[PDB]
């Protein structure tokens, strides 16, 4: 397809019997599975495990998460997504980027509701960094109901503006930035 340009090439790469051996070994869910290979093989091995179902992939730094995330976008499209890391520390007196927070909560809701097509395709590979892997989070964040806006929906206006106000949306007289 047009979204995944190198899907067939990764299919041909997965014809290799060692990757197939990784499929067979990962099928019965072993406790320990240690794999050794070059860096360029990451996208392959990930795409290997994705053959058995969804999975999380933790890269070292954020740059590796972006690189591998794009490489996996070349094979899965919108099915693979990235869980970005905070720009600040959990107890630093600075809020992280509104776009990073939005991507985090949006990915968490996409994981919670894979069938909701308005959020995107169901998730296959979720790539992140060590930061977002370790840094915990409140479990009630996915329950926060977002504001769904579609042409033709029946919503009263004051409920919409009040709901956005409750979602930490800054009310201005002229939209310039996100949030």
């Amino acid at each position: 397809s047009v979204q995944t340009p190198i899907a067939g090439l990764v299919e041909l790469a997965l014809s290799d019997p060692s990757l197939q051996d990784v499929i067979r070994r990962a099928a019965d869910r072993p406790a320990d599975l240690a794999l050794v290979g070059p860096a360029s093989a990451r996208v392959l091995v990930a795409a290997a495990l994705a053959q058995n179902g969804p999975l999380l992939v933790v890269a070292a730094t954020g740059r590796e998460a972006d690189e591998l995330t794009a490489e996996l976008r070349g094979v899965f499209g919108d099915s693979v997504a990235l869980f970005p890391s905070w720009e600040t520390l959990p107890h630093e007196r600075l809020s992280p980027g509104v776009e990073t927070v939005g991507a985090r909560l949006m990915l968490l809701r996409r994981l919670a509701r894979p069938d909701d097509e308005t959020l995107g395709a169901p998730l296959r590979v979720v790539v992140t960094t060590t930061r977002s892997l370790l840094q915990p989070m409140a479990p009630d964040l996915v329950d926060i109901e977002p504001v769904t806006l579609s042409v033709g929906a029946e919503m009263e206006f004051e409920d919409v503006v009040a709901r956005l106000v409750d979602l930490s949306y800054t009310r201005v007289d002229m939209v310039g930035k996100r949030g």
Binding site: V36, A41, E67, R93, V126, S132
Partner: protein
Amino acid sequence: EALLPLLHPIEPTTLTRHLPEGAPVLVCDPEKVRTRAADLIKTGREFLEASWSTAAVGGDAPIDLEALGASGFVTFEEAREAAREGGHPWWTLSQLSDESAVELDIRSAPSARGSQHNLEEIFAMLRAHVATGGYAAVVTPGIGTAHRVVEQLGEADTAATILEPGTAPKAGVVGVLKGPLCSGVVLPGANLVIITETDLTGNRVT
């Protein structure tokens, strides 16, 4: 949010809980992930003690830094234990070799960085590979950059076809493709050889 364990006191949960049940966790380069993780714990420690020091907070009772330790970074061992206790296997992929490891039959593509003789040796490597009947493919993130590689392939005793997106190469001809790939891969088990233009010019074009 820095005051979240004191404003919204709910026992936090890790990221691995939100994953679908049974979804494995693949940690790439586990040692760099480990050391870096330690560095995050040290840094968050420092920012917690600094931004919320009783000398700088205020006049009455302090903020109970131990209470704010809950949302702090979770150590590597605890993240592995919670991920395993949630039904998510903790699998690793390292670059350093190990005797007790499933060493994949996968090797990196030859990078001709800083050598046009090695570059012609890469074109000729693809030439000998496709003369044997092997699968060769060139992944180029640039839109239209694949055509120049095609011309140089038909020019240097090779066959190049702009493979349509989402397709695998056929034997005998090199299949130049557009897509996102940083470094190439050589798989002799699948008779496949994938070269990126990063390997040809030594340039990362994300």
